[PDB]
Symmetry: D3
Subunit: 250 residues, 6 copies
C-alpha cells in the first residue's frame, strides 16, 4: 500500500488516514482494548514522534479499542521498576512520550471509548475531548502500587480540575464518570458508544477545511503554555516516582 | 469642558466620569454598536494608555453600544494583512493593546451589552464581568478567515475555561450564552439589558469608597500573574497569525 | 508524655497524633474558635515549620474549633501596621507562613468547621478540602480595612476560582457557602458538622496505608507548581499591602 | 518631522534619511539634570519613539561631559508620601516597559559618567562609551532607599548575580575600561569619536531590511523583557516603603 | 553496531568499549556543507543518539579545517514560502530539543571555524576548540533574516545579554582565544591535539557510574532547556516572516 | 544575647552594637568537618538567623585554613537507602531556602579552601576570599553521585552555563585569583586581613536604614530564589537515585 511505513510499524496501534489528512490512531492489543506493556511504554513515544514528523497528518484522532480506552496493564512487562537502572528507561520514555505527543503539530481529538484508568495524561495533551457514555476516568495504578503519580497526571489533572479538586482526585483515586468529566470541562461532548467515532470524524472534517498552516499554528499557539507546564514537572515527577518504586524493596 | 482632552480624542469611544473618579468608556460607531476597524485597532491602544496614565480614574467600566458589545468588523480597513509589512503594524498594535489595557491600574468592570464575537480578549483582562441576558461569546473571525486566533484569545480563553474546554471553544468556534459563561465563571452576574449599566455603576460606587491606593494596588496584585501569562504568548500568537495571513496568498 | 515538645508549645494550636502518624492540628483560642492575633501571625509559621520537620507526621489534618474555622481577629494585637517598621514583621511572617505550610511534606487535609472569613489562603495550600454544611468563605478584612488582599489570597483564590471569578470574589468581598465552594471545586466534600472530623480521619487512615515516601513525594509532586505560584506573588502582595496600611495615615 | 521631536524639553531628536534616530538627553543644551519632569515625560517619549515606524535604528545619548550625573531631588516630589511615590512607581514601570518596547536596535552612546538611571543603558543592544565614562548606582544608597528601579535586575544580569550584587551594595564605580572587560561596554572610544562611531554602526544596521531590524530586536529582547517584568514593580514598591521610612 | 551509525550521509559514528561516542559531521569526508538534508536529518540523528543507552559520553565534532563554515542556500528550499519555511521551523525546534535531550555529557570538539549553527555547540557541556577556530553568526544578517534559530537565546546566555546582542547585531567574529576569555571555550588546543584531548576528557568521565553521567547531564540542563523552549519557536516564526519579506 | 547563639556546636556567633553578626563554622574551634549533624542543624541555624531582626548584616565564614574542605561521609547516614536519603533531601531543600531567606546583606569571608558546600557562598551578596582560597565541587563526582545540592544551579549562574558545566563535570579547581577574574570573588585579601575587611564592609553597610538593608536584600535575591527553587528538589532527588545506585 501507498500509506507510510510507520502505519504498520506498531503492533499496538492501528492507523487509518483519509484524503483530507485526517489520521485516526487506535490503540489495541490483538484488536481488543489495549493492555499497556513495557513494549507500548517504549514504542508509543516513537509512534507519536512519527505522527508528528509526517506533514500529511492534518488532524489526528486518538482512540482505543473495544469498550475501554485503557484499563489494563501487564505490570511485569514494564521491567524491574524497583531497580533504578531499569526505572531510568521508564523515566526517559516517560519524558519523551509527553514531549512527542505535545509536539504533534495539528489539532488532536481524543475519542475516549471507555474506561481510562491509566495513562489518561495522554488525553490531557489533546485539544478536543469526546467521550462515550460508558467512559470513566481514574488514576488507578499509582496509589495501588504505592508509587508517585508522577508521569504527568500530577501536572495535567490539577490543570484540568484546578489545583484543589485535581489533588483530591489524585490523592483519593477518585473515579469520574463521563458526565462528571463533562461538567468539569475535561470532556467536551458525551456520545453514545455507537456515535463516538462518527462525531470525532465530523469534527475532524470541519477542522480539515482550514488551511494547513492554520491548523498547525493554531495547535502551536494553544499548546505553548501547556508544554511549559509539562516541562516544568515531568522529569521531577518521574524521578520521585522512581525513588518510591525503589523503596518498595524496603 | 473641564474634562480631560483625551475624553473626546477617539471617534469610537465615549467617555463619562463622575465625581468619584468612576470612568465609563463606551465603544461605538456613530453612536451604534461598534464596527471594529483598522482605526480602532490603532487608536484603542492609545486610548487605554491614556486612561491608565490619568490618576483621576479610580474605577473603569468598559462597555459597548446598542445590542452588541462587538459583533462587526470592517475587514478591508485593517489593511493588507497578507503583506508582512502591513501585518507588522497590526502585530505591534496587538501587543500594545493588551499591555496597555492590563496596565490600567484600577479595577476594571466589563459591562458586556450583547454579542462579543471578536476581541473578547479585552473582556478577559478585566476584573468583574457583567453581561446582559442577550450576550453571547465566540471567537468568530479567525477560523472564518483561516488565520490563527493569536491575538490573546489563545491565552485568555484557556485561562478562563481551562486548557481543555478553552481549546475546544477556540478550535470549534463554540458560542457561549451569557448563562453558560456564568456557569463557567467567566461572567459574574447576568442582568436584564435595562439593568446592566445601573449594576455596573452600583458595583463601581461600592469600590470607589476604597482608598485610591488600595484600588490601584489591589488591581496590581490581582493582575501580576495575568500579565505574565499574556506576555508569554501574545507576540508569538500574533507572529503565527501573521504567517497564516500571508499564506492566504498561497 | 512521649509526644513531641512542639505539640504543647503553641497556645493556639492543639495537637493529637495517632499510631499511624496522622496528626490533627486544631486552631483555638482558649478552646473556642480562633481569634487571630499578632501572636498567631508570629507563631503559626514556626508551628508549620515544626510540623514539617517531624518525619513522624505522615498525614496532617488542619482544622479549627467550635462553629467557625477563623472568623475573628484582634486587629490591635497585630501591631501598628501603618508603621512600615512594624509592618515589616508582618510582611516577613506572611511570606514564611505560606512557605512553611506548603513545605509540610505529607498530604494535608483541611477540615473547615465553619466560617473562614480570614486567612483562608491556609486552606488553599492543602490537598483535600472538607467543609461542614455551615461553612462559608470570604476575604472579609482587607477591603473592610482598606488594604490590599495581598497575603496570598490574591494568588490562591484566582487559582481556585479561575482568574475571572477569583478577582470578582476578592474585589466584591463575595461570600461563598460550602455548597457553592463545592460546585466551584474548592471544597471536595460537604459534611454535617457532626461527621466532618470522622470523615477527615477516614480519608487520613486510607492515605496512611501508603508507604511513607509515597505520601511525601506525592505531596512534593503535587505542590511544585503551587509553590512556584505562591513564590511569584507573595512578597509583592504583602509589600503593596504594607503601603496601603501606611496610607491609612493620609 | 514628527510633532514629538519638539514635545520634550529635555530630549533633542535628529533623524536621517535611513531612519536612524538620535535621541539626546539634555538640560538647556547641557548634561541632563534628572527631574520629576523627566521621570514623568521620558516614558511618553520612549512610547512615541516606539510607535513611529520611520525609526529604523535608535541612538540614545546624553549631552556634554556626562550621560547622567545630576538629579534635582526635590523636583521628584515628596517621595516619602506613598500617594506621591505612586506616581514615581507607575512611571518607573512604564519607562522600562516603553524603552524595551522600542522595536528596533538601540545603540547607547554613553558620553561620560552614568551615575543614575544606567538601567536605561542596560535595555539597549549595543553599548559604546567614551573613555571618560564611569558607571555607578549613586543615588539609592546615598538617600537610603532600595536600588529598585531596574538596576536591581539589570546590573546583576550584566555583571552576573555575584559581582552585580557587590556593585549595588557597595556603590562600586566602574571605569569605561572595567565595564568593557565586564562585557557591558562593547567599544571604548575617545570622546571626540564616540558619536561618529555610533552613527557608523547605525548605518551598517540600517542596510538591513526593516522587518529584520524589528524582529531581531524582538527576538533578542524576549528574555530581557521577562526578567524586567518579574522584578520591576516589586523593586519600586519596596523602594517606596524605604522612601516612606525616611520620615522615621 | 547500531543501524543508525550508517543511516546519515553527513555523520560518521565511532564508539569505544566505554560507551564514548564520537559523532563527526562531514560532506564526503570533508568539512560539512550544511544543507536542507542535514537540517531535516540531524534532528533524527540526535534523537537516535539520545535513545541509545549504550552512549555514555558523546563527542560532537566536524571534519577538516572548519566545524561548520559552508551552507548550500538553495538546498534549504524556498524559505520565502511559508509552507516551505514551516518544514525548516519544525525541524529547527526539533534539532535543539533532541540535541539537549541527549542524556549524557556532550563534549564539543570545535575543529575550526563555526560560522553557522554554533547554537549546537552551545547545548554541550564541555567546549574544546582548536587554535584556528573562530565563532560567528554569519548567515542570518547576510541574508537579511532574523538570527532566530537558537543563536538569539544561547549567544546572549554565553556572552551575557549585552555582549551577546552586540555579537549578533554586528556579526562579530570571535577567535578561539577571545571565546576562551569569554568562558565559551574551556580549552584551546593545537589542531593536532584537539581530538586526543576530547577523548581524554571523555575517558575520565566514562569512569563515572552510568546513572551519574545521565542525571548530572539532566541536572545541568534543566534551566538551559527551559530557556531554549521559551524562545526557539518564536525566534523561528519571526525568522520565517523575514524570509517571506525577501520577496518584497 | 539570643539563645540560638549557643545552640549549635558547629557555629560560633558574635554580634556588635550595629547588628553585624559574624557566623563562623567550626569543628572544636578548627576548620569545619561537615557531618550529618551540620547537614541537619545548619538549616535551623540559618532560619534562626533570619528570624532575628537584630541581625542587620551577616558575615558567614569558616575557621582555620579552610572554609570547608572536610566531610565525615559515614556521619551523613546510609545515603544509599532512599528512606535515609529523604532526610538529606528535605534538609538540602531547607538549607538553601533558609539561607536565601536571611533578609539582610550577607558577606562571605572565604578563609581558605571551599571544596564542598560552596553553594552556601553563592547565596551571599559580597564575596571576599583569602589569597589561599581554592573553589571546587569535590565530593559529588568523587562519590559517583549527582552534584545536585544547588551547585548545579549556582555554579552555572556564577560562571555562565558553559564554564559552569565544565567546572562541575571536570571537578575543576579555581584559585582565589581565577574566581576573582570570573567575578565570583569580589576582593582577594591576605589571610590576616580578610576578617577586618569583611567587618569594614559590614560597618559601611550598617550605616544604612534597617528597612533599606532588608529590602535591598529582598530586591537583589528575587531572581536568585526563583532559580534555586526551580532546580533544588529535582537535583537532590536525582542525586538520591545515584546514591541508591552505589549498591549496584
Ligand atoms: O506505565 C508506567 O507509567 C510505568 C508503570 C510501572 C509499574 C507501576 C505503574 O502503574 C506505572
Ligand atoms: O482585528 C484584528 O485582530 C486583526 C484582524 C485582521 C483581519 C482578520 C481578523 O479577523 C483579525
Ligand atoms: O493577619 C494579617 O494578615 C495582617 C492583618 C493586619 C490588620 C488588618 C488585616 O486584616 C490583616
Ligand atoms: O529617579 C528616580 O528613580 C526616583 C528617585 C526617588 C528619590 C531618590 C532617588 O535617587 C530616586
Ligand atoms: O540553516 C538554517 O537554520 C535555515 C536557513 C534559512 C535560510 C538562510 C539561512 O542562513 C538559515
Ligand atoms: O553533604 C551533602 O550534601 C550530602 C552528601 C551525600 C553523600 C556524599 C556527599 O558528598 C554529599
Ligand atoms: Ni501558570
Ligand atoms: Ni533566567
Amino acid at each position: 500500500l501507498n500509506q507510510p511505513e510507520y502505519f504498520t510499524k506498531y503492533e499496538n496501534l492501528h492507523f487509518h488516514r483519509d484524503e483530507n489528512g485526517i489520521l485516526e490512531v487506535r490503540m489495541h492489543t490483538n484488536g481488543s482494548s489495549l493492555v499497556f506493556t513495557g513494549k507500548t511504554h517504549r514504542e508509543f513515544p516513537d509512534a507519536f514522534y512519527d505522527i508528528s514528523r509526517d506533514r500529511d497528518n492534518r488532524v489526528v484522532i486518538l482512540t482505543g479499542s473495544g469498550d475501554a480506552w485503557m484499563a489494563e496493564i501487564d505490570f511485569p512487562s514494564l521491567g524491574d521498576v524497583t531497580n533504578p537502572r531499569e526505572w531510568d528507561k521508564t523515566y526517559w520514555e516517560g519524558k519523551k512520550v509527553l514531549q512527542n505527543l505535545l509536539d504533534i503539530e495539528v489539532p488532536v481529538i481524543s475519542a475516549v471509548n471507555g474506561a481510562a484508568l491509566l495513562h489518561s495524561e495522554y488525553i490531557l495533551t489533546t485539544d478536543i475531548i469526546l467521550a462515550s457514555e460508558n467512559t470513566v476516568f481514574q488514576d488507578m495504578p499509582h496509589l495501588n502500587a504505592g508509587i508517585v503519580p508522577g508521569d504527568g497526571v500530577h501536572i495535567l489533572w490539577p490543570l484540568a480540575l484546578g489545583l484543589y479538586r485535581g489533588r483530591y482526585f489524585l490523592f483519593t483515586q477518585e473515579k469520574l464518570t463521563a458526565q462528571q468529566a463533562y461538567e468539569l470541562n475535561v470532556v467536551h461532548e458525551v456520545l453514545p458508544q455507537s456515535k463516538l467515532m462518527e462525531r470525532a470524524w465530523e469534527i475532524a472534517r470541519t477542522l480539515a477545511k482550514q488551511p494547513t498552516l492554520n491548523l498547525r499554528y493554531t495547535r502551536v499557539a494553544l499548546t505553548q503554555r501547556l508544554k511549559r507546564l509539562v516541562n516544568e514537572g515531568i522529569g521531577y515527577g518521574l524521578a520521585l516516582e522512581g525513588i518510591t518504586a525503589t523503596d518498595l524493596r524496603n
